[PDB]
Amino acid sequence: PLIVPYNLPLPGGVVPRMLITILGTVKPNANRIALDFQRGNDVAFHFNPRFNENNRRVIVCNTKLDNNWGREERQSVFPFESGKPFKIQVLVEPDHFKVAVNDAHLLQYNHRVKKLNEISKLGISGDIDLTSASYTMI
Ligand SMILES: OC[C@H]1O[C@@H](O[C@@H]2[C@@H](CO)O[C@](O)(CO)[C@H]2O)[C@H](O)[C@@H](O)[C@H]1O
Ligand SMILES: [Cl-]
Numbered sequence: 001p002l003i004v005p006y007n008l009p010l011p012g013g014v015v016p017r018m019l020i021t022i023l024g025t026v027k028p029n030a031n032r033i034a035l036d037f038q039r040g041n042d043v044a045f046h047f048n049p050r051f052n053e054n055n056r057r058v059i060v061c062n063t064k065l066d067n068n069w070g071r072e073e074r075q076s077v078f079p080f081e082s083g084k085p086f087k088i089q090v091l092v093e094p095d096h097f098k099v100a101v102n103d104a105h106l107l108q109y110n111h112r113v114k115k116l117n118e119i120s121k122l123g124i125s126g127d128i129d130l131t132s133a134s135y136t137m138i
């Protein structure tokens with residue numbers, strides 16, 4: 001029962017073999033979830049399930065540099081369901097973030113921000129009950 005939006009500091013940024021795990025339950029009638037891995041004001045990796053964009057469910061990923069969003073990467077596979085508990089695992093690999101939901105691989109997002117050790121906050125927001133947010137080195 002963490003307060004949302006929730007900031008999880010990532011000390012010394014991210015690095016390959018860091019695993020970030022987010023446990024929560026989606027609210028009933030959800031509209032959105034967002035993970036924002038931030039480098040200061042920049043968003044290195046925005047992971048944004050949208051429950052109703054023109055009556056479709058889509059995961060939007062992007063990067064925000066100097067206040068400008070870049071080119072969206074969209075994933076139609078949509079493992080989240082209103083009302084249901086989920087697990088998001090974000091594994092940093094050398095050339096991308098690797099995301100699994102409920103133990104199933106979902107997507108990868110190539111590193112656009114190169115200074116991984118400056119990506120030192122994760123913001124978790126949206127229509128969830130957040131249970132826990134943590135990290136470990138594997
Ligand atoms: O790219 C991620 C960001 O997308 C913004 O929405 C985009 C608008 C602006 O509303 O035009 C699109 O690119 C296509 O319709 C939208 O996806 C969101 O406002 C941001 O929060 C962020 O998700
Ligand atoms: Cl495009």
Ligand SMILES: [Cl-]
Pocket residue numbers: 051080081082
């Ligand atoms: Cl749903």
Ligand SMILES: [Cl-]
Pocket residue numbers: 112113114115
């Ligand atoms: Cl960079």
